Amino acid sequence: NRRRTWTNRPMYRKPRLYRMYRTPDVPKGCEGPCKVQSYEQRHDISHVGKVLCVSDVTRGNGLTHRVGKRFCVKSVYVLGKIWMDENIKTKNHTNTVMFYLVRDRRPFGTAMDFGQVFNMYDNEPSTATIKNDLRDRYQVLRKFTSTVTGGQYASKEQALVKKFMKINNYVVYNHQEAAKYDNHTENALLLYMACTHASNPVYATLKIRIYFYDSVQN
Amino acid sequence: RLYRMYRTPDVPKGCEGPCKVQSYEQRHDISHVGKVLCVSDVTRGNGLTHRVGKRFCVKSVYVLGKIWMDENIKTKNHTNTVMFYLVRDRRPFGTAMDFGQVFNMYDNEPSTATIKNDLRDRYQVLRKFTSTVTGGQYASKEQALVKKFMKINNYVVYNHQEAAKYDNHTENALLLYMACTHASNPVYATLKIRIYFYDSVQN
Amino acid sequence: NRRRTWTNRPMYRKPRLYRMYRTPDVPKGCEGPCKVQSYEQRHDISHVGKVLCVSDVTRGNGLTHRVGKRFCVKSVYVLGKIWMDENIKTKNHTNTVMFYLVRDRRPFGTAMDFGQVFNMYDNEPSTATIKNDLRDRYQVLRKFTSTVTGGQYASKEQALVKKFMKINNYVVYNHQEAAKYDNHTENALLLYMACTHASNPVYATLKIRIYFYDSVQN
Amino acid sequence: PDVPKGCEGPCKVQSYEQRHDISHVGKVLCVSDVTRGNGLTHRVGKRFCVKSVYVLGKIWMDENIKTKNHTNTVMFYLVRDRRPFGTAMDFGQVFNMYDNEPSTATIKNDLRDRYQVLRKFTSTVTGGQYASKEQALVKKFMKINNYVVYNHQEAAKYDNHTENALLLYMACTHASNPVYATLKIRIYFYDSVQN
Amino acid sequence: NRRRTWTNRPMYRKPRLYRMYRTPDVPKGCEGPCKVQSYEQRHDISHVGKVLCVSDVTRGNGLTHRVGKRFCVKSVYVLGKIWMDENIKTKNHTNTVMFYLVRDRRPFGTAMDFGQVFNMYDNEPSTATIKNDLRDRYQVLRKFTSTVTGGQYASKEQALVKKFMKINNYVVYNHQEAAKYDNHTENALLLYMACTHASNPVYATLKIRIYFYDSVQN
Amino acid sequence: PDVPKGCEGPCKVQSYEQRHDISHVGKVLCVSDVTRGNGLTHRVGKRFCVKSVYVLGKIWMDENIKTKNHTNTVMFYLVRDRRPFGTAMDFGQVFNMYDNEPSTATIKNDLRDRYQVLRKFTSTVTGGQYASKEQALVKKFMKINNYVVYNHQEAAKYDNHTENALLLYMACTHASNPVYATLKIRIYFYDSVQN
DNA sequence: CAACCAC
DNA sequence: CAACCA
DNA sequence: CAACCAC
DNA sequence: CAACCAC
DNA sequence: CAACCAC
DNA sequence: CAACCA
DNA sequence: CAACCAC
DNA sequence: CAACCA
DNA sequence: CAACCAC
Numbered sequence A, C, E: 001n002r003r004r005t006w007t008n009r010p011m012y013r014k015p016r017l018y019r020m021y022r023t024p025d026v027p028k029g030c031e032g033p034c035k036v037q038s039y040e041q042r043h044d045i046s047h048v049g050k051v052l053c054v055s056d057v058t059r060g061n062g063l064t065h066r067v068g069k070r071f072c073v074k075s076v077y078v079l080g081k082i083w084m085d086e087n088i089k090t091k092n093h094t095n096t097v098m099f100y101l102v103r104d105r106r107p108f109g110t111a112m113d114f115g116q117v118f119n120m121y122d123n124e125p126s127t128a129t130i131k132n133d134l135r136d137r138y139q140v141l142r143k144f145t146s147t148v149t150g151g152q153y154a155s156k157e158q159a160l161v162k163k164f165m166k167i168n169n170y171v172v173y174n175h176q177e178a179a180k181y182d183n184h185t186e187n188a189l190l191l192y193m194a195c196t197h198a199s200n201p202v203y204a205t206l207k208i209r210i211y212f213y214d215s216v217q218n
Numbered sequence B: 001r002l003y004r005m006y007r008t009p010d011v012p013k014g015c016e017g018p019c020k021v022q023s024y025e026q027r028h029d030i031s032h033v034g035k036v037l038c039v040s041d042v043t044r045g046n047g048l049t050h051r052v053g054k055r056f057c058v059k060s061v062y063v064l065g066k067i068w069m070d071e072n073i074k075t076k077n078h079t080n081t082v083m084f085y086l087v088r089d090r091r092p093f094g095t096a097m098d099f100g101q102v103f104n105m106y107d108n109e110p111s112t113a114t115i116k117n118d119l120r121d122r123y124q125v126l127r128k129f130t131s132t133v134t135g136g137q138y139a140s141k142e143q144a145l146v147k148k149f150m151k152i153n154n155y156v157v158y159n160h161q162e163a164a165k166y167d168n169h170t171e172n173a174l175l176l177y178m179a180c181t182h183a184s185n186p187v188y189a190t191l192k193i194r195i196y197f198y199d200s201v202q203n
Numbered sequence D, F: 001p002d003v004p005k006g007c008e009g010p011c012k013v014q015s016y017e018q019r020h021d022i023s024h025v026g027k028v029l030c031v032s033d034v035t036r037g038n039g040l041t042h043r044v045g046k047r048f049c050v051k052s053v054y055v056l057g058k059i060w061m062d063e064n065i066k067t068k069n070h071t072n073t074v075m076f077y078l079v080r081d082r083r084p085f086g087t088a089m090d091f092g093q094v095f096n097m098y099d100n101e102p103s104t105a106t107i108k109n110d111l112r113d114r115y116q117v118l119r120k121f122t123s124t125v126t127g128g129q130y131a132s133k134e135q136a137l138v139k140k141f142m143k144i145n146n147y148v149v150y151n152h153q154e155a156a157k158y159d160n161h162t163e164n165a166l167l168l169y170m171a172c173t174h175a176s177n178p179v180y181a182t183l184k185i186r187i188y189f190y191d192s193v194q195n
Numbered sequence G, I, J, K, M, O: 001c002a003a004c005c006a007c
Numbered sequence H, L, N: 001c002a003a004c005c006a
Helices: A002-007 A016-020 C002-007 C016-020 E002-007 E016-020
Strands: A031-045 A050-053 A070-083 A093-104 A138-150 A158-172 A188-195 A202-214 B015-030 B035-038 B055-068 B079-089 B123-134 B143-157 B173-178 B187-200 C031-045 C050-053 C070-083 C093-104 C138-150 C158-172 C188-195 C202-214 D007-022 D027-030 D047-060 D071-081 D115-126 D135-150 D161-163 D165-172 D179-192 E031-045 E050-053 E070-083 E093-104 E138-150 E158-172 E188-195 E202-214 F007-022 F027-030 F047-060 F070-081 F115-121 F124-127 F135-150 F161-163 F165-172 F179-192
Touching (some): A016 A031, A093 A158, A138 A158, A188 A202, B015 B035, B055 B079, B055 B123, B055 B173, B079 B187, B079 E158, B143 B187, B143 F070, C016 C031, C031 C188, C070 C093, C070 C138, C070 C188, C093 C202, C138 C158, C188 C202, D007 D027, D007 D047, D007 D165, D047 D165, D071 D135, D115 D135, D135 D165, D161 D165, D165 D179, E031 E050, E031 E188, E070 E093, E070 E138, E070 E188, E093 E158, E138 E158, E158 E188, E188 E202, F007 F027, F007 F165, F047 F165, F070 F135, F115 F135, F135 F165, F165 F179
Antiparallel strands (some): A031 A202, A050 A188, A070 A158, A070 A202, A093 A188, B015 B187, B055 B143, C031 C202, C050 C188, C070 C158, C070 C202, C093 C138, D007 D179, D027 D165, D071 D165, D135 D161, E050 E188, E070 E202, E093 E138, E093 E188, F027 F165, F070 F115, F070 F124, F135 F161
């Protein structure tokens, strides 16, 4: 019944039920089924830092597709593992991976890059807050850490990241669809990752999942 | 008066109109895990090489091209065969399932491949065909030609929606599954997969 | 009933009835309703001669549109008037307009032009047959004349052309649709007009109508 | 049914383009003139069958003549010589007639057996100062299975003929004023197998 | 419909349809759906030879289960690959793998073993026929070969075995079910494999599939 | 049974003995190039029927190329275009294909009505340093009964064709290195009676 | 067909 | 009969 | 039908 | 059959 | 035959 | 045709 | 089918 | 509770 | 929630 109605739907549009009615699940303005979108990747983290846009969703009929240019992201579910490489783990040290889920109210360009948005002493991600000028544009919705420790004879090779986070965030795109950061006219959810230890890196195998609904507004 | 339309020979039953072609020209990078592509992918529209309704009958598939080895791989002495399977998925959904999770087999070996015991009602193998290629330092068989015409009366039903996507197919979707017999090194397959179809008289 | 079924038809295709069944009106192979196409124009005729393609039909869903690249023209209905201009009609002379409805089995280019296909002595349209070499390519399906006579005090200012002609002719286009002579892959119906008198011209207000059906073949 | 009896090969065409200047005395031209050779539109042997003649074109009045009020029909006679010899014989000395009048033209008594009139047809043109019929269109196709023969030599001439030979004789009905005739005469023939 | 009837069947017995009726597919005596049974394995072949029983099927309600002690094997489908190991393939030689699908009308013990049934000169599998005395007991239903060639610079590493073979063979078990060669009271299908080259071995990754029906007789 | 319909006379031959140096790009040659004339091997009229083609010879690798460890098939396509204009088109602009690969080659979508592939045959050559297959023997007889037409002109050229015209397209399957093809293409034809 | 003449 | 429509 | 060309 | 040649 | 196009 | 499934 | 054995 | 599915 | 910024 769940699956049938979506396949047997009228050509270009959602099933009638969705159009009609509203679950308590869906936020204000927006309608339709809770569409998912996933970013599965092994991110190689550094001291300088890494970025990715997690609102990157293309436009289309089906599921995992925005319909219009506007849509509301209701929640983000980051899950996976951060870990040390087999040659690095021998060396005795510790590193926390700093995750910052930020929003930029006025986005453009390809990517902002870490340390060109976060102000910090000696390029240190633990002392990181938004820059004086960009403070208006960028806001940190969530931040969360994850520790990993190397050692010759005894090591903590890996750490499991599992973090659900609800953030009712409305985003607006261009007319053209590419599922790219460049296309976002309104705010776009960015995940910024940074390794606390200066020299050696850490890996982060992550599924970043994002849950969203299509906007009726405008 | 109204005479019934004498449907010409060499069009399928319940189908009429001109035979429409659809091509999927590509260099496929074949592996041991196995590659897939849907060959019933055709969009809905008034243009040529589009379907009109949701129903149409593929009458024949024509696979032609070449399997070949890279310049660094061809020096290494081995043999490997590409195993083509043209399978029908009767009741499809979602993304097209990978070669590993449709066919069951010992040690992910495509030569021992048959359809999984569980989902045997769903998938059927219409045609299978091999193609062997041999590496060698001084004397290699670098490449192998593929030329394979196969007549299959396959009636696909589509989603209401217009799109040339696999998710749309309601039933009898056509998948071409490919897999290399040798585990380590890969093989290239430059292929034109052509498909010859007729639109259904119904709807 | 006639009109309703065509408007209420399924989206991209003809009404079911046409698909099913075949009238005695429609030729072999082809199906569907008898689609018309009109070329209404005032042609200014000369001694050198004028050309137009009358199989120029674009591609589309509706009526006056070919569906596929192939279609069968069943009949041509040329109707209208040839006439003399108010300053020319004073002068005493006679001119017949020579109409040639020809078919070129292997067409290309923009237009062949008159006297580059018809061989004739002293550029004279009355002595006109197809050239020695092009004889294989071009065939004259119909030819027909129409006389007009000038005079100071007594004139025959105008003459009424009315000519229906059935010619079951199959034509094939490119994939692209422009309703242009250039697009015809197979034979295209050309109308060639020429004034018999050398010096002064004559006008020809013509509706050239063409009746055709869409091909099931190939 | 296409190719005639005793002859074979493709239907070869032969054309004659000319502005014939017509008179009351009468003009002649041999339409069976075709040369011998391996090329196209040539005869191969000395014998061939002319299946059909296609005369098409215009008969017209000159600009200084058309002002003068009169009428003239041009009489076209397509005739067969069964015994050609020397040069082509003139209109006046083949046909007999009252006072050189082409409308009364029939073949002379003595050589009535030699020449036969296969087809005759008229074409009228009328002058006039303020209103005129300057021109008229000729378009006569006629089928006449005519087997002709030539000498051992070749030049597409009336002198080289023997047995049958097709002459077109043209004559203007009005005495004083001349008229022009732009004519494509097109003969369709097949090479003989017999003899 | 196919799948539903088998799951919704009455407790201990086959669907009613099977009980009632008989397809042309099923052999004489026996009834019911065509039950499969698979033996997927990497067999390590030698000059001395290897054996396996391919009628090894246990007893039970479901599919891939015999119901009674008797059943008819209709066909065997051997498919897979024979191949040379990465260190062996360097050496220049050739070996054919000899497959013998034999039947022993009066089976007992754990396994008969190769060369204790096949008579051959100098333990050579190519010269192999059934022994003088056992000739009555054992019969070779099919034999088939497969060649593989080693070489330093140019090798034929592997060869694809694909062999369907229809052999309407009735077999009878003990009351107890173990899917073992020991349990066969009547004839049991045995596959005997042997490498033709004396010294080095070859591998054989094989799915041996067997298709059978349950007996109504006795 | 020997002479085709609408045709006459002796079965005239025409040969194209040549060493064709083949590439990945694709070579072409028109096999119905026959001159007009009274002589033997010439056509007489503008029309004739090619009954059968007999391709025979050898594809082979050069002495410096054969040492290099590789393989290539030579793809022969005997195509016919219903409409010939100007010079003969190159292999790439008739057949559409991925990466200019002749093993994927079918006729372009537009000119599919125009060009038809009558016969398609291959031949492999495998070069290696210490062991090789330098050459392969091509032998292929094939009946077709292709009626072709020409201009009034008399020259064995693709430009002079009208209606059907037999083109042999040849393409090496390997990208970089070339191969030779010593070939006798022998066309068997009869002169046409029709038209 | 043209008009006593012939195919 | 007129010209794809009854 | 138009005129050796083709459907 | 091998290829317009013949038996 | 080759592969929706033709003879 | 592939291999008990349509 | 494989090879005097059997179904 | 797990993570848009019951 | 994260940290003067915004929803």
